Design a protein around this ligand. Structure first.
Ligand SMILES: Nc1ncnc2c1ncn2[C@@H]1O[C@H](COP(=O)(O)OP(=O)(O)O)[C@@H](O)[C@H]1O
Ligand SMILES: [Mg+2]
Lengths: 76, 52, 77
């Protein structure tokens, strides 16, 4: 329900030009309800999200590229 | 005339067949990684080194 | 995770979780005979567009908030 409410709020923000203030709505974990996180003072550096996305995408691409494994038995 | 050389020894034929089978096995093993749609292979050595 | 720690210093758990979920969903796509090249291209395009959208619509300038922004970021961390 919480994720559905977040998605509904963000969909309203994206499709309604006059409701663009809903972009800041995040999760209020103490009460379990959506909350304006920009007004609540919940901030993160943009570089954190950007680098997380880039590194995660590269790692997923690297692992996904594999389709066969050869595991040589140890010589010892 | 009729029959020619008997070719009593069968080892050369077996050796040729084994060599061909090994080469074909290697080719079939590496066929999957050919072309733009071919995917990479992952090889782990006895020492534990991993290469993709 | 170690690279994320070295280069940024925060979000170490988030990157691992996101990468694992991405890999799981990509494998789910591949099991439906979707070629891995198509999945990789889609992932790359989605990552680029997500970065662009973040930089264009989801950023807040800290010059309009003052010292309280630094304190709030530290508290969130
Ligand atoms: N006060 C808060 N209210 C809502 N969400 C928060 C709050 N503080 C942190 N978060 C969220 O919790 C998530 C987990 O962060 P955390 O796991 O502590 O960082 P790391 O991944 O570096 O360990 C972050 O993505 C952040 O957005
Ligand atoms: Mg953190």
């Amino acid at each position: 329900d919480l994720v559905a409410k977040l998605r509904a709020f963000h969909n309203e923000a994206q499709v309604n030009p006059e409701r663009k203030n809903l972009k800041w709505i995040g999760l209020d974990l103490s009460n379990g309800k959506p909350r304006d996180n920009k007004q609540a003072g919940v901030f993160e550096p943009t570089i954190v999200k950007v680098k997380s996305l880039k590194f995660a995408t590269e790692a997923a691409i690297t692992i996904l590229r594999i389709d066969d494994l050869i595991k040589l038995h140890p010589e010892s | 005339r009729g029959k020619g050389a008997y070719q009593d020894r069968d080892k050369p034929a077996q050796i040729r067949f084994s060599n061909i089978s090994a080469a074909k096995a290697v080719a079939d093993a590496i066929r999957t990684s050919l072309g733009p749609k071919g995917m990479d292979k992952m090889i782990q050595d006895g020492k534990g080194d991993v290469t993709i | 995770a170690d690279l994320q720690d070295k280069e940024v210093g925060d979000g170490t758990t988030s990157v691992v979780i996101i990468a694992a979920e991405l890999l799981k969903n990509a494998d789910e796509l591949v099991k439906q005979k979707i070629h891995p090249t198509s999945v990789i291209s889609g992932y790359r395009l989605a990552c680029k567009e997500a970065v662009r959208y973040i930089n264009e619509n989801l950023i807040v300038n800290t010059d309009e908030l003052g010292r309280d922004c630094l304190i709030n970021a530290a508290k969130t961390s």
